[PDB]
Write an enzyme that holds these catalytic residues in place. Structure first.
Site, PDB file in Angstrom:
ATOM      1  N   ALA A  83       0.902  -1.180   0.181  1.00  0.00           N
ATOM      2  CA  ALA A  83       0.120   0.056  -0.032  1.00  0.00           C
ATOM      3  C   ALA A  83       0.743   1.272  -0.130  1.00  0.00           C
ATOM      4  O   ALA A  83       0.381   2.188  -0.657  1.00  0.00           O
ATOM      5  CB  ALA A  83      -1.009  -0.088   1.098  1.00  0.00           C
ATOM      6  N   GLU A  86       7.019   0.032  -2.968  1.00  0.00           N
ATOM      7  CA  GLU A  86       7.084  -1.349  -3.780  1.00  0.00           C
ATOM      8  C   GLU A  86       8.205  -2.200  -3.101  1.00  0.00           C
ATOM      9  O   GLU A  86       9.090  -1.714  -2.221  1.00  0.00           O
ATOM     10  CB  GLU A  86       7.516  -1.075  -5.247  1.00  0.00           C
ATOM     11  CG  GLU A  86       8.753  -0.153  -5.142  1.00  0.00           C
ATOM     12  CD  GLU A  86       8.502   0.568  -6.429  1.00  0.00           C
ATOM     13  OE1 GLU A  86       7.604   0.449  -7.280  1.00  0.00           O
ATOM     14  OE2 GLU A  86       9.620   1.443  -6.720  1.00  0.00           O
ATOM     15  N   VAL A  87       8.244  -3.583  -3.339  1.00  0.00           N
ATOM     16  CA  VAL A  87       9.035  -4.503  -2.599  1.00  0.00           C
ATOM     17  C   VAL A  87       9.827  -4.880  -3.993  1.00  0.00           C
ATOM     18  O   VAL A  87       9.204  -5.575  -4.769  1.00  0.00           O
ATOM     19  CB  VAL A  87       8.272  -5.884  -2.144  1.00  0.00           C
ATOM     20  CG1 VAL A  87       9.307  -6.825  -1.782  1.00  0.00           C
ATOM     21  CG2 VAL A  87       7.590  -5.377  -0.824  1.00  0.00           C
ATOM     22  N   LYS A 102      11.689  -3.994   1.236  1.00  0.00           N
ATOM     23  CA  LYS A 102      10.545  -3.389   1.157  1.00  0.00           C
ATOM     24  C   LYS A 102      10.378  -2.036   1.407  1.00  0.00           C
ATOM     25  O   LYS A 102      11.200  -1.370   2.396  1.00  0.00           O
ATOM     26  CB  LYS A 102       9.268  -4.114   2.245  1.00  0.00           C
ATOM     27  CG  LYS A 102       8.066  -3.740   2.204  1.00  0.00           C
ATOM     28  CD  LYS A 102       7.185  -4.903   2.472  1.00  0.00           C
ATOM     29  CE  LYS A 102       6.111  -4.330   3.873  1.00  0.00           C
ATOM     30  NZ  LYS A 102       5.953  -5.730   4.641  1.00  0.00           N
ATOM     31  N   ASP A 195      -4.681 -10.710   9.470  1.00  0.00           N
ATOM     32  CA  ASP A 195      -4.924 -10.779   7.855  1.00  0.00           C
ATOM     33  C   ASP A 195      -4.144 -11.962   7.402  1.00  0.00           C
ATOM     34  O   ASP A 195      -3.122 -11.904   6.771  1.00  0.00           O
ATOM     35  CB  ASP A 195      -4.372  -9.382   7.331  1.00  0.00           C
ATOM     36  CG  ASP A 195      -4.337  -9.650   5.808  1.00  0.00           C
ATOM     37  OD1 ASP A 195      -3.682  -8.983   5.157  1.00  0.00           O
ATOM     38  OD2 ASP A 195      -5.041 -10.412   5.331  1.00  0.00           O
ATOM     39  N   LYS A 197      -4.035 -14.766   4.721  1.00  0.00           N
ATOM     40  CA  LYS A 197      -4.282 -14.909   3.099  1.00  0.00           C
ATOM     41  C   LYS A 197      -3.139 -15.141   2.285  1.00  0.00           C
ATOM     42  O   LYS A 197      -1.876 -14.778   2.510  1.00  0.00           O
ATOM     43  CB  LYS A 197      -4.767 -13.484   2.885  1.00  0.00           C
ATOM     44  CG  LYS A 197      -3.857 -12.185   2.812  1.00  0.00           C
ATOM     45  CD  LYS A 197      -4.556 -11.092   1.923  1.00  0.00           C
ATOM     46  CE  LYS A 197      -3.505 -10.183   1.993  1.00  0.00           C
ATOM     47  NZ  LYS A 197      -3.797  -8.902   1.234  1.00  0.00           N
ATOM     48  N   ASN A 200       0.028 -13.149   1.721  1.00  0.00           N
ATOM     49  CA  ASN A 200       1.070 -12.911   2.601  1.00  0.00           C
ATOM     50  C   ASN A 200       1.841 -14.123   3.030  1.00  0.00           C
ATOM     51  O   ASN A 200       2.918 -14.019   3.792  1.00  0.00           O
ATOM     52  CB  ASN A 200       0.410 -12.781   3.990  1.00  0.00           C
ATOM     53  CG  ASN A 200      -0.024 -11.256   3.901  1.00  0.00           C
ATOM     54  OD1 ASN A 200       0.541 -10.247   3.618  1.00  0.00           O
ATOM     55  ND2 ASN A 200      -1.174 -11.151   4.407  1.00  0.00           N
ATOM     56  N   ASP A 213       4.352 -10.468   5.541  1.00  0.00           N
ATOM     57  CA  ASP A 213       3.763  -9.178   5.998  1.00  0.00           C
ATOM     58  C   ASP A 213       2.970  -9.089   7.205  1.00  0.00           C
ATOM     59  O   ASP A 213       2.225 -10.069   7.462  1.00  0.00           O
ATOM     60  CB  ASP A 213       2.859  -8.819   4.812  1.00  0.00           C
ATOM     61  CG  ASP A 213       2.273  -7.177   5.442  1.00  0.00           C
ATOM     62  OD1 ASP A 213       1.931  -7.193   6.444  1.00  0.00           O
ATOM     63  OD2 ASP A 213       2.514  -6.581   4.511  1.00  0.00           O
ATOM     64  N   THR A 232      -9.088  -7.370   5.078  1.00  0.00           N
ATOM     65  CA  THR A 232      -9.433  -7.983   3.622  1.00  0.00           C
ATOM     66  C   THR A 232     -10.778  -8.127   3.400  1.00  0.00           C
ATOM     67  O   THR A 232     -11.585  -8.394   4.170  1.00  0.00           O
ATOM     68  CB  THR A 232      -8.406  -9.097   3.505  1.00  0.00           C
ATOM     69  OG1 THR A 232      -8.075  -9.061   1.949  1.00  0.00           O
ATOM     70  CG2 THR A 232      -9.296 -10.261   3.821  1.00  0.00           C
TER      71      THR A 232
HETATM   72  N1  LIG Z   1       1.115  -8.227   2.630  1.00  0.00           N
HETATM   73  C1  LIG Z   1       0.656  -7.793   1.448  1.00  0.00           C
HETATM   74  C2  LIG Z   1       1.436  -6.239   1.288  1.00  0.00           C
HETATM   75  C3  LIG Z   1       3.014  -6.744   1.158  1.00  0.00           C
HETATM   76  C4  LIG Z   1       3.267  -7.545   0.227  1.00  0.00           C
HETATM   77  C5  LIG Z   1       4.778  -8.221   0.331  1.00  0.00           C
HETATM   78  O1  LIG Z   1       5.271  -7.788   1.208  1.00  0.00           O
HETATM   79  N2  LIG Z   1       5.328  -9.002  -0.431  1.00  0.00           N
HETATM   80  C6  LIG Z   1       6.681  -9.502  -0.520  1.00  0.00           C
HETATM   81  C7  LIG Z   1       7.066  -9.687   0.796  1.00  0.00           C
HETATM   82  C8  LIG Z   1       8.341 -10.191   0.766  1.00  0.00           C
HETATM   83  C9  LIG Z   1       8.874 -10.272   2.257  1.00  0.00           C
HETATM   84  C10 LIG Z   1      10.283 -10.967   2.184  1.00  0.00           C
HETATM   85  N3  LIG Z   1      10.876 -11.209   1.364  1.00  0.00           N
HETATM   86  C11 LIG Z   1      10.451 -11.168  -0.200  1.00  0.00           C
HETATM   87  O2  LIG Z   1      10.843 -11.680  -0.863  1.00  0.00           O
HETATM   88  C12 LIG Z   1       9.093 -10.418  -0.157  1.00  0.00           C
HETATM   89  C13 LIG Z   1       8.549 -10.371  -1.416  1.00  0.00           C
HETATM   90  C14 LIG Z   1       7.206 -10.099  -1.471  1.00  0.00           C
HETATM   91 CL1  LIG Z   1       6.405  -9.653  -3.078  1.00  0.00          CL
HETATM   92  C15 LIG Z   1       2.243  -8.902  -0.023  1.00  0.00           C
HETATM   93  C16 LIG Z   1       0.735  -8.271   0.186  1.00  0.00           C
END
Ligand SMILES: N[C@H]1CC[C@@H](C(=O)Nc2cc3cc[nH]c(=O)c3cc2Cl)CC1
Ligand SMILES: N[C@H]1CC[C@@H](C(=O)Nc2cc3cc[nH]c(=O)c3cc2Cl)CC1
Lengths: 379, 399
Positions: A83, A86-87, A102, A195, A197, A200, A213, A232
């Site tokens: 939100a 970006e990660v 993140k 949350d 799902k 996560n 998350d 959610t």
């Molecule tokens: N929770 C919601 C918002 C956060 C999102 C999110 O944080 N995604 C991710 C978290 C991590 C954590 C650690 N390492 C990673 O490689 C990684 C990759 C993604 Cl894509 C997921 C949907």
């Protein structure tokens, strides 16, 4: 009453105690922040301030430069979007090590009153020290963003997975049960996730599961329950949908399970409000006897829901019977799906206007304050 | 660079480095400060502010409690009073050790634009590490005052001394020469005193001498000079060059201290300031007229030398004694005797040694008035005013 030689040690403690709100790095965060919130034309017009900024100009610039900054990370590819930022997958330039960073827009975090939520997430990821929880190695910050450097999960989300495969009851049993050991890990730390799902749930190079998350998490009091202020749509639990004026996680669980075998939300509805009321009418809103059972045992009202008593109660459930794994051994067995990775940077399990900034103040607004103390090094 | 590790090889340093404006203590000082200047009703109405003070409430209260506060000190007796606060004998409750703690009202220090002077005093007393410079052990602060805990001097100031004795040329020779070794010490730390006077000259339990107040100090540039539009010092003991200072010529070297010293000597043998006058302004111009303001009651109880030395300090900068080298002063005829040599004067038998009842005999400190109405406080702000920022970093604890 402590003594001198004592008090001094005791203080060095705090100056080192990383759980301390005033660990050395937190004090530096304070000085940093202050210099940010002050160096504005309008304000510098003050004796005290301009004198200050003129004294900590050189010094504080030196600091900024030494401590960890985003310039230290090469961003391989964006692999997700939350939100508030970006990660992205990254490699440490000097260390060559690879993490997942993140990002969090301080701005967006202030615009929405949604501030001071990431403290529980930082704490958890940084000290859970659990195979079930993603590990934070570093957390640092500049004027614009918070950064959370963390154990990269090459596996991918349970979302992509459920996308790509015809999930059998076997797998279902596996992933679900791991999610259960993990959620119990969280609750042992005295938190509730709120949350649960697929979005996560992530996977390590060995195809096992962790939670990724924790923004939603909330500290639960002595009695194990919580005074609550959602999360959610497709999953949310009703019992907590009325406190607004624990076992809830278990609800989310059952929902997930359904989603997994079925291919869609147990209360999906084109209109979202629809999904909502449909969950309120749970009672009236290819597969195994057990699958069905379990699901409907979670998908019941709080007080008769599966897991109201003990987690063990859930473990023992019939659908949790097999000749392929035991509970305190699950973590070490063969994952249902193991990721084939080309290198230490295969973003294969991750499929494929902008943002603004704060307005120059005319007076002290102190926008850096809600962020002092966020810097954390793991060594 | 190169890389991460070297970054840390500067980092860990900036925290150990006691002379660093950001030694660990300094950082704690910053957070403390902030909490102070922040916790007010009006300000608290700010989401960022309120949230902050609500997260560091507990923690910051902890800190305040552990670190050195004034509640740690038993206040035996008030033995002095400067401009910004009193100077009181004290004993540490926990350690039972005895020090002299000088206070400084952060308010008064802000009222008058006279702020940011105390940094040079602190650095010197804490790092001089010299027999001639009183030593600071601890420096802490609360919302109200700066505190400086330091080597107590049971001996007393040379004002009391000069008060109670018929000082003879011998004694004079002694005190003066120690004053010279000491001023030379400070001079070598690259500083100018600018305020030499009996009031600042204290004695240790062995009757030997140290300088006790350094507010007036100012670091001198490479050429040995400093430049000060509005100049300091004391009505009587002032050098004239330092005196005729303003937006314009306010620049001078170290021989101005030497002047102050000659004034001293006169004071000690005569019993009155070399340029005393009932109206102050009078002493001022009288100083400006030194070439013909200089005199001595025709009591031939003064030496050829005494007179000599005195007049050699009390001349115009450019021809004054010590314009060349300190050595030059050392060699002067009035500094001739068969009782002490320079590099040994510290070790000899003082001219007066204090007979002390205990480790707390305030016998050499005449009584003074307590509360004179000086304790006033900052006004509650309507907006952030930051009154504690000038004092971030004042905290220092001793090795
Ligand atoms: N929770 C919601 C918002 C956060 C999102 C999110 O944080 N995604 C991710 C978290 C991590 C954590 C650690 N390492 C990673 O490689 C990684 C990759 C993604 Cl894509 C997921 C949907
Ligand atoms: N600068 C003027 C105003 C301050 C005054 C002054 O500071 N006096 C004192 C200084 C010290 C210093 C160290 N230790 C002491 O015990 C001690 C005692 C006194 Cl009474 C001197 C004249």
């Amino acid at each position: 009453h402590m003594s001198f030689e004592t008090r001094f040690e005791k203080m060095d403690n705090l100056l080192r105690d990383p759980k301390s709100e005033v660990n050395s790095d937190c004090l530096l965060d304070g000085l940093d922040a202050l210099v940010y919130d002050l160096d504005f034309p309008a304000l510098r017009k003050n004796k005290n301030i301009d004198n200050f900024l003129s004294r900590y100009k050189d010094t504080i610039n030196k600091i900024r430069d030494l401590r960890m900054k985003a310039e230290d990370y090469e961003v391989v590819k964006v692999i997700g979007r939350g939100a508030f930022g970006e990660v992205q997958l990254v490699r440490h330039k000097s260390t060559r090590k690879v993490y997942a960073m993140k990002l969090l827009s301080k701005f967006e975090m202030i615009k929405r009153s949604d501030s001071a939520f990431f403290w529980e997430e930082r704490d958890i990821m940084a000290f859970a020290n659990s195979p079930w929880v993603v590990q934070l190695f570093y957390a640092f910050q500049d004027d614009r963003y918070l950064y959370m450097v963390m154990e990269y999960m090459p596996g991918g989300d349970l979302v992509n997975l459920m996308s790509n495969y015809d999930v059998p009851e076997k797998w279902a049993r596996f992933y679900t049960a791991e999610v259960v050991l993990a959620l119990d890990a969280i609750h042992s730390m005295g938190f509730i996730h709120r949350d649960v799902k697929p979005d996560n749930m992530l996977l390590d190079k060995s195809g096992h599961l962790k939670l990724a998350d924790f923004g939603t998490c909330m500290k639960m009091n002595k009695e194990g329950m919580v005074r609550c202020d959602v999360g959610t749509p497709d999953y949310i639990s009703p019992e907590v949908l009325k406190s607004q004026g624990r076992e809830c996680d278990w609800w989310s669980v059952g929902v997930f399970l359904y989603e997994m075998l079925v291919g869609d939300t147990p209360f999906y509805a084109d209109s979202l409000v629809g999904t909502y009321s449909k969950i309120m009418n749970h009672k009236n809103s290819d597969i195994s006897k057990e699958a069905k059972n379990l699901i409907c045992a979670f998908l019941t009202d709080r007080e008769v829901r599966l897991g109201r008593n003990g987690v063990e109660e859930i473990k023992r459930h019939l659908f949790f019977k097999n000749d392929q794994w035991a509970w305190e051994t699950l973590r070490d067995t063969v994952a249902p799906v193991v990721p084939d990775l080309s290198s230490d940077i295969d973003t294969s399990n991750f499929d494929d206007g902008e943002e603004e900034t704060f307005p120059i103040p005319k007076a002290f607004v102190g926008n850096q304050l809600p962020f002092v103390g966020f810097t954390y090094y793991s060594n």
